[model samples]
Target: TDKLTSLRQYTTVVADTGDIAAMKLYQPQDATTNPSLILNAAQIPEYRKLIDDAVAWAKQQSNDRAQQIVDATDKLAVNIGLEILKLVPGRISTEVDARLSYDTEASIAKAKRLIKLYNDAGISNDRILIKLASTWQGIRAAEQLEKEGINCNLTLLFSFAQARACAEAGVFLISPYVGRILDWYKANTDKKEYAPAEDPGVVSVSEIYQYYKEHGYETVVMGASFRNIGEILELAGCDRLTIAPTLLKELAESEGAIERKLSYTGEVKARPARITESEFLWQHNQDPMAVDKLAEGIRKFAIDQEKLEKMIGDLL
Candidate 1:
């Protein structure tokens, strides 16, 4: 994309991977880190030493260092994000402890602690986006943190209810998973394949985009987890999209005509969306998909977190 003259014209490029070297190359406006990305990046030949060092250091602690290791991993997440932030004008999203997603108070404490860590490391709150799973509890925690001057990006969003709830809570941004929703549809409908226009994931994020646009919500809508160029193009005018390097390379390689299709600034009516803290819980329960997916996503991250803990133990 650096070589492509038009690359800068469209799409604010972001480094989806946690490889700090890749971050240096892409110089994306911001970077995102999840447990999977952190685990994958830690396994890289070049970055494996970071994990080994952390694990080795944890082994010498007087106690199990389990809490220390968890804190260390989060600090690593913050360090990686800080490295990327130095290369971009936008803030990097360092996620909170996913295991705390269901515990409102714990999630809030973890978020506040993360902000303190970043600030202690010389990275200001404005350069960091605290990421939280878009659970009912998680949104509430974010709501609390927002009042304390901490911005949040709600992740693992799959339904309109989740987006609506977060926006109503005054979240800073939302990364709606477009590809994951399509995967769910394919698995549900047994349609092994579908065109981009017909992709359920594409439709999912588009619905979310339209809702945010029509409702005059200030929360930024970012289309995430795209499977192809068509889906990417479909969400061209989204507030942002965190695309993988492979798709980014493909877009840079192709010479096909692309245009921005949607705009938040368009002539759209500001529909009064029925949103409130009191109604969010009821509406969230009404959406079985959101309920199931949020739980499933939290479980998956928790499992990965456990795996990471075991790996740290083994190294010790």
Candidate 2:
């Protein structure tokens, strides 16, 4: 049949989007959404109803206007999560406020707040993955959430340091942005041309996957933020992958089979010592691409998050 089916054979493919139509079309196992995507979707006429509902619900939650806006934003995210969950059989990755990446306490509290929203709707906590940015705080937040039986994903990872810290924290999963890594190298360095195997993004994910497998790290590696089908094909055997519909649709219509490119031959090493906060900071600092790319994404998401908050405020 198609490469999508072939990929599904070895890898769990999640739709890295909030579009209901795309979710329905691909029928992926899981779906994910972030502030940026949720905010972008808010501009569309169709999702306005959801926004309206969220705003209404937000007002009812409290007397404080600022708190109401915050509630509306999270409600909008949950509303979208609920819609996509109806289409995808597995979990929904709902992000915490991206603006609070550096605040572990806020991230942890906000994650519970998100979980409570879903709980109030009478849904199981297992059905959702609280996505946090891959800051030391984010990883630590997941470490705490997991203890509370709240599974989470350490997202926007661009370096092995981030992935390893997530693993050390026993995060449920880590999303290494495959394409963004290449984006940084291409934009910063003279190396513009790369084959799929040689692509910096693909190599980072592959190397992390291999290392995780070798060290018996139980955290799932979910390659995300793809730019081309070749990078997707290169990491065909990754534990899970969240792809945008552009590639999912292409994978659906293109007829072919892809070989599993990432496999561990059962060889194992005892995982290294735990990665402390200072170590995590130092290691992540060493990877200039990780710092620059992460800074870029965090700032961009902040812009969208602010717009989303204003939209919710205006709607109220």
Candidate 3:
């Protein structure tokens, strides 16, 4: 079996892209979409109809032209998600606005709106996961949404504190970024290269996986932001892995013996602790890497979101 086929035996593979055609090719169990991926897809000529249809729908729904542009992008996100869902058998994660990342009420409102958009289109809540930043507000918003049958995917996670908080809040899943973590270490340190075993990002996900398994937390750990196929192989037995199309294709074509590096069996030691708002913030602050990356991730997403909005506006 190719590495992709081999990895599926131990982990649920998720396609981390907005390109529907790519999703059709890899057929990942689940699909995850963010502002950046959505923006990238929007620029592609083939995806223009998805954008055009969304803008027309937005126009019919509202007379406020400015708000129509805003509504159009949100609709476009759901539309892309809808198309991706047709290709994947599992759920699709549609992210809320990054601008609302720090505002609990706003985040919840935006999430609810997105859910309503999906629900109205005959897509059940079970088929969707709202993606949110791993902020205190975002986590709290997810807690409320989960109670109402809306699952969440906590992204931009870079610290143990973020994982602990998400698990404590009963989040459905947490995406502990692998490549971003490795990027930080590589840029800050003199070490120019790392083996799969020595990669800090891989190590971080393995630690979180062990912690979750030991504590018997039901929160799924999906490793995201991988820099290479080695990082993906390093985390073979994670709950799920969200891979971009480029790497997915590489894994599909590459031949290798993929080893399982993580597993949860029998009873294991666990460090259990509750993460309050104060503890969450302070602990996240203590880790410079997490703090910097979390902020940078949000900024990058927000910027891409603005660019997407303008693209939709220009079409209007």
Candidate 4:
């Protein structure tokens, strides 16, 4: 099979970069954006005007108000996403204010408001996936939203419990950060060299994928945060894999290629006996690693969002 056929046979390719032009070539099914990606995109000369206009329009509505401007920043992010969606054929993942990761109700409210803004822009609820941190609160919010016909993409997921919670909650998707897991091990490990077969991140995501697949969960697993081509290649048969344009180009050039490492054809299946979203969250809360990391990730993004909001006010 050629690459596209190979690509279609396994993972649903998603463009992880903010560059819209690349969408035409890669033809990724969906796109994802975060404060970091949007911040980087805003710095590019070609996309600066998008940033300027977003700030200007935000200012046009409200004068240097913090909360209003923050809302405007999210709107700006959504606007950028809408422009990107026009280039691709599938949904876009827009995130919630990570600050509210601990407050389920507040997170839900912000997510609802974001969806409303998208709806106002003529984007249907089905075309958008509200991304939330995989905290106990975030997962609960996702559970309630799913009942309300709003689908969610649970981000910053590390542990199996998060995946299990999302699956049981009937989330639309979950993004397991493959590279982050590798990075954690790298920081702690005394050994310097490793065989490609020994990569930790690949193993983590692969396990999560098998659990979801074996359990017959509908929550799509899209492995994100790749450190290199090896990580991406290792996740070949994932439900979806978000790869940056740089990696897409790298794959395009490496000709005498390699076989895919994973497939549904494989018989190994290690699933928990059962799952309930509420029980999953209670269990997730008990896991020190997932809880701490989720909180840290949320606070980190919330700070960036506030910074972006301030810039929006000044730019406007």
Candidate 5:
């Protein structure tokens, strides 16, 4: 059997792609999307139809241009998610606009707007995970949304402080990018390569996973942004993992049963029961990698979001 099939014994494999049909190829439990992935989908003829329909619908809403743009783009984001839901049995993570990463109210409002779009289409809140960056504001937004029965997948996470805050907020889940963390360490430090077990990105997710399990936290840990299967195999027993097409295909093609790498040892290391806003900021800021990558991740996602806007503008 393929390693992918074997790995399923320990992890809920998720497809990270704009190509929803690819889920049929690997059969991931859930799927994830961002502006970058949606931008790719909008360029494809079939997926482009989803965008066109949103544009036409937005035009008929009798709203002003600015309002219509807002209406259509958000409609389009959830619209793609609706299509993805048909393929996966679990959930689809739809991200809010990254540009609003720092604005608590705006981020919260956008999440509601996106949820409303899905709700109008007969989708329940359980089948969707609102993807959010782990900014202080975003975490606050999610804390409120969760109480309203909206599930969230707090992502762009890079530090233990970020993890603790999300857990304290009672988020549905947190996604720590394994590969992105490795990228930072490799560029900044003298260490050029690492055994999968020693990889900083892998270590980050492992620490967060063990901590949550040790404390009996319900918030899930879904490892994301792996640069290699080794990084993945190291976090073999993580709650969930969202993998790219290339890596997913690699797992499917390779043949081997790997041992689980992470587990809770029934020991919590004096973890604080609560992470205050000031503490969250200071701890996250202290981690140079978390700070740089969080900002860079937001900026990069916003670039694609703007491109999507331009695409809709021309198509409008």
Candidate 6:
């Protein structure tokens, strides 16, 4: 069997893209999309019809230019998500606006609005995962949403503080980034050589995985933002992995004998007591990498979201 097929034996492979066509080939169990992916997909010639449909609907809803643009972007995100849901048999992660990353109330309102759009389209809440950033406010928003039976995927997670808090809050899933973590270290450190096992990103996910399994937290841990196939291979037995199509293609074409590097069957040391908000903030603040990367991630996504809004504005 190919590496992709073999890896699936231990982990649920998730496609991380907005392209529905690629999902058909990879056949991932779940799929994820963010503002950047949606914007990228909207630019493609093939997806012009989807864009036009959303814009047309937006024009019909309101004549106020700003409101029309706002409505159109929301409709566009759901439209893309609906098309993707048709292709994947499992759930699709739809992100909230990154600009609301730090506003707990605003984030909740936006998430509810997104879910309602899906529900109105006949897609159940269970089939959608509302993705939010890993900021304290974002986590607080997720905690409240989970209580209402709405699932959340906490993204841009960098430090254990984020993971620990997510687990305590009982988030549906936590996407601890891989390549982004490595990027932070690579820029700060002098050491360049890294084996798959030694990769900071891989190790970060491994620790989070072991902690969750050991502590018996039900929150799902999905490794994300991989830079290469080797990084993907290193975390073969993770709970789930959301991969981009480029690496998925590489794995499909590669033939290699691989073994599971992690599993719930393995033993783990006892985890510390539950974390309070004060402790969570302090711990997160102690880690410069996490602090910097989390800020950077939110800023970058917000910029992309603005760029997307501008595209919709021009169309309207």
Residue range with the least summed lDDT across 10 consecutive positions in model 3: 264-273
Model 3: per-residue Cα lDDT at residue 92: 98
* Superior by lDDT: candidate 2 or candidate 3: 3
- The collision pairs in model 3 are none
Candidate 6, superposed: residue stretches over 4 Å from native:
266-273
lDDT of 5 by residue, 1-316 (tens): 8878878889999999878778878878999988889888887788878887899888988567776787788888888888889989999999999999999899989999889889989999999999889999999999999999999999999988899899999999899889999999999999999999899999899888888888889998999998998998888889899999999989999987877777777655555658888988899999999999999999999998888888777776
lDDT of 1 by residue, 136-244 (tens): 8898999999999999989999877788788788899899888877767766677889887788878778788877777777888887887777788876767777877
Cα-based lDDT for every prediction: 0.76, 0.89, 0.92, 0.79, 0.89, 0.92
Candidate 3, residue 216: lDDT: 82
TM-score of every model versus the real structure? 0.88, 0.98, 0.97, 0.88, 0.97, 0.97
Candidate 4 global CA lDDT score = 0.79
Alpha-carbon deviation at 43 in model 4, angstroms: 1.3
lDDT at residue 265 of model 5 (Cα atoms): 74
Which is the better candidate, 4 or 5, if ranked by TM-score? 5
What's the CA error at residue 114 for candidate 5, in Å? Answer: 0.6
Error of 2 at 86 (Å): 1.1
TM value for model 1: 0.88
lDDT of 2 at 167: 84
RMSD of 6: 1.4
Q: After superposition, how far is residue 28 of candidate 1 from its true place, in Å?
A: 1.5
Which residue runs does candidate 5 get wrong by more than 4 Å? 267-271
Instruction: For candidate 6, write residues 132-225 as lDDT tens digits.
Output: 9999999999999999879999999999999999998899999999999888888999977688989999999999998899888889999999
CA RMSD (A), model 1 = 2.8
Candidate 2 ranges beyond 4 A from true positions: none
Candidate 2 per-residue lDDT, tens place, 1-316, comes to 8999999989999998889998878888888888888987787789989998998899898989899999999999999998888888899999988889989999999999999999898779889999999988888889999999999988889877888888889899889998998888899999899999999999999889988988888898999999999999999999999999899988988897878988888769987889888888899999999988887888888888899889888877
**How well does candidate 1 score on lDDT at residue 19?**
70
Alpha-carbon runs more than 4 Å astray in model 1: 1-10, 52-64, 264-282, 285-288
